[PDB]
Paper text:
The host proteins SERINC3 and SERINC5 are HIV-1 restriction factors that reduce infectivity when incorporated into the viral envelope. The HIV-1 accessory protein Nef abrogates incorporation of SERINCs via binding to intracellular loop 4 (ICL4). Here, we determine cryoEM maps of full-length human SERINC3 and an ICL4 deletion construct, which reveal that hSERINC3 is comprised of two α-helical bundles connected by a ~ 40-residue, highly tilted, “crossmember” helix. Thus, we conclude that hSERINC3 is a non-ATP-dependent, nonspecific lipid transporter for PC, PE, and PS.
Göttlinger and colleagues presented evidence that the ability of Nef to downregulate hSERINC5 involves ICL44, which contains an acidic cluster motif (EDTEE) that is a proposed binding site for the clathrin adapter protein, AP214. For these reasons, we also generated a cryoEM map of the ICL4 deletion mutant (ΔICL4) of hSERINC3. Using the Fab-proximal bundle as a reference, the distal bundle is rotated ~5o in the ΔICL4 map relative to the conformation in WT hSERINC3. H4 is paired with H8, which has an ill-defined density in the full-length WT map attributed to conformational variability (a) and is well-ordered in the ΔICL4 deletion mutant. e TM α-helices in the primary structure colored as in c and d. (2) Our comparison of the full-length and ΔICL4-constructs of hSERINC3 shows the rigid-body rotation of the helical domains and bending of the H4 “crossmember” helix. These features are similar to the conformational changes of MurJ in the flipping of Lipid II. In the WT hSERINC3 cryoEM map, H8 is disordered, whereas the rod-like density for H8 is well-defined in ΔICL4-hSERINC3. These observations suggest that H8 dynamics are integral to SERINC conformational changes and support a role for ICL4 in the regulation of these structural states. a–d Superposition of full-length, WT hSERINC3 (gold) and ΔICL4-hSERINC3 cryoEM models (blue) shows a rotation of the helical bundles around H8. e–h The top two AlphaFold models of hSERINC5 also reveal conformational states similar to those of the hSERINC3 cryoEM structures.
Residue numbers in the entry:
A (entry chain L): 102 to 117
B (entry chain A): 34 to 68, 93 to 296, 334 to 353, 397 to 424, 439 to 466
Write the structure that this text describes.
Amino acid sequence: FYSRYSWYGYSYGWSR
Amino acid sequence: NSTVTRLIYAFILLLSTVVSYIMQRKEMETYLKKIVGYKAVYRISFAMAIFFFVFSLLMFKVKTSKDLRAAVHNGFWFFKIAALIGIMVGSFYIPGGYFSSVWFVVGMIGAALFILIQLVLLVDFAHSWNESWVNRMEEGNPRLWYAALLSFTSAFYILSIICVGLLYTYYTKPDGCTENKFFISINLILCVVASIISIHPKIQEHQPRSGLLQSSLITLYTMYLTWSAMSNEPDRSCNDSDNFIGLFVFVLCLLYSSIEKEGVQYSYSLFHLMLCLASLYIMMTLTKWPAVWVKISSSWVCLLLYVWTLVAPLV
């Protein structure tokens, strides 16, 4: 999956 | 069982605390004089520390619930309260004076250690909160949770900025009080770094659930600590609600921390010791440059702990 360096941290929800 | 017992001990601790606070009232002064409020609170705190320490030592190295020590940990409340009252009565029988200053120093030491452990618990709490919130955001409607996090973090930053502005307005002047300016600036720069360090790609790669929310929480707590620090400065030319807020964070931290045959889910002895340190901190909070140094050192070690908790796993 495409994790990213977002403010809240390391996740992929925005680009699942 | 573990949580229930921990909450019971926290509740009795808070009961003792409120007792100490109410003794300080001028109404109770006449009744005590028949044997001021500061001395009574000192005696109560000494009793608290003594009995909490002795129970802590008694529960040292608890291995199993079958051991009668753990059973007592789960019960014998009458015996606990009896010992509490007995030592409390004995607390007054010690002569005052120099011993008062000795206990004053001991209380400063205990308050320092307690604020250390309390900040450890606070950072753990913030990490857990951020983790759970981000997981929920990932699962469900992303936008709603995302807006929630953004709003809360921005609000906490806003409170931090506005309180720092209040500090500028009140506790600092161009003509002097350069030490207050120095404290404000150092705390601001360290907390700003703590914010920035939360955005290092390597850090996130090593700490997936790190985020700005906990950074904001730590910054706000640090600013509160600073406000309390100069709040206690005897020099009014350079210098209550701060103490009340300190007690509120005390209660919050103690509650969260409170929240068998084969092994103990937690160290009962260290739990009692933290309770004792909490009592000592309560003593000090209910009451010169050394105090300012203690508070600023607490702020520094807090931010050092934050940096460590963010970096060490990468090491």
